[PDB]
Amino acid sequence: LSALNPELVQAVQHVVIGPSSLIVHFNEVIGRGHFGCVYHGTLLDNDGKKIHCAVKSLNRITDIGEVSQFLTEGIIMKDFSHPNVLSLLGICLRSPLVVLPYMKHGDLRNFIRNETHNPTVKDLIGFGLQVAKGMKYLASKKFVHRDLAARNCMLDEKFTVKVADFGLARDMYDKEYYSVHNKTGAKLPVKWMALESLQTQKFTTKSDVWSFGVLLWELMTRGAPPYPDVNTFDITVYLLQGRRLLQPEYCPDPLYEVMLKCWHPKAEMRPSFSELVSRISAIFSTFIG
Numbered sequence: 001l002s003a004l005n006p007e008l009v010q011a012v013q014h015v016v017i018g019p020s021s022l023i024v025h026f027n028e029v030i031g032r033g034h035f036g037c038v039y040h041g042t043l044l045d046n047d048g049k050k051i052h053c054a055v056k057s058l059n060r061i062t063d064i065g066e067v068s069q070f071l072t073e074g075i076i077m078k079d080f081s082h083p084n085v086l087s088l089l090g091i092c093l094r095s096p097l098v099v100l101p102y103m104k105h106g107d108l109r110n111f112i113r114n115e116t117h118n119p120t121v122k123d124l125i126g127f128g129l130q131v132a133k134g135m136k137y138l139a140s141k142k143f144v145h146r147d148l149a150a151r152n153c154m155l156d157e158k159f160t161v162k163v164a165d166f167g168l169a170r171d172m173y174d175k176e177y178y179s180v181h182n183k184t185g186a187k188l189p190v191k192w193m194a195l196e197s198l199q200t201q202k203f204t205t206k207s208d209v210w211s212f213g214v215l216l217w218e219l220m221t222r223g224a225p226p227y228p229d230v231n232t233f234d235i236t237v238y239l240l241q242g243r244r245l246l247q248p249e250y251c252p253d254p255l256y257e258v259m260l261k262c263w264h265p266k267a268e269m270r271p272s273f274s275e276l277v278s279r280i281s282a283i284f285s286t287f288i289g
């Protein structure tokens with residue numbers, strides 16, 4: 001709207017998609033989050049070719065400061081660029097819309113839960129490897145994801161895994177797994193959170209590593225829910241007692257060791273994503289398919 005700083009407006013120019021270049025099919029919803037519903041759309045680029053996109057309508061913006069923060073991040077997130085991270089194609093201002101590349105196979109969790117598919121143990125470990133490669137990138141940019149999970153990674157038509165659900169695309173795409181803190185009101189995916197994050201609400205790249213370990217366990221169970229018989233808030237106690245996710249039936253031992261390392265109670269003794277890329281590449285390499 002009109003109250004926006006013009007210099008900020010000028011700084012975001014290169015992110016902004018104009019209505020003439022974007023066709024959104026608003027009659028069908030393909031995805032839903034908290035902050036908006038998601039629709040298929042086509043983006044006319046330089047050449048006049050249709051880029052297939054997922055377009056999100058941000059429904060809960062109430063004031064102009066929220067919009068400015070939204071543009072400010074748009075500018076940051078547009079510079080991010082890795083094969084295993086979901087890119088931002090841009091934003092439509094003229095509801096604001098977030099334009100993302102369309103991901104043919106949807107979120108990684110629904111993909112592996114879908115019983116018509118048979119991803120092998122090698123394929124599953126490959127998906128995890130790809131996640132670690134994108135997280136390696138993000139961490140190199142000293143960006144903390146805070147909500148890494150298989151529901152928040154996407155899969156494209158070539159089965160490239162894209163880490164998603166951060167920046168302008170950040171949402172709860174499955175609200176079942178988020179709780180509210182008694183004394184701060186933040187929305188917490190508790191069963192993916194590191195011990196320290198549950199105790200002191202502090203997030204770091206090493207707490208991204210904890211979540212990555214839970215994500216690997218998701219892969220090895222083909223998307224079973226973690227701690228099914230541990231209630232949301234009994235989880236801190238469960239972990240503080242020195243207990244962890246059990247090894248999945250078809251999880252190879254060396255990968256379970258990787259997981260367990262990811263959940264070390266000392267953030268600093270957890271491996272880095274660069275070490276996870278190395279070690280998981282090795283594990284992936286020892287399978288046939």
Ligand SMILES: NC(=O)c1cnc2ccn(S(=O)(=O)c3ccccc3[N+](=O)[O-])c2c1
Binds near residue numbers: 032101
């Ligand atoms: N729902 C879809 O078919 C679809 C296809 N492609 C994309 C690309 C992004 N989304 S999303 O926003 O809805 C989404 C959906 C679930 C998890 C995360 C994300 N994310 O991009 O952050 C997509 C959704």
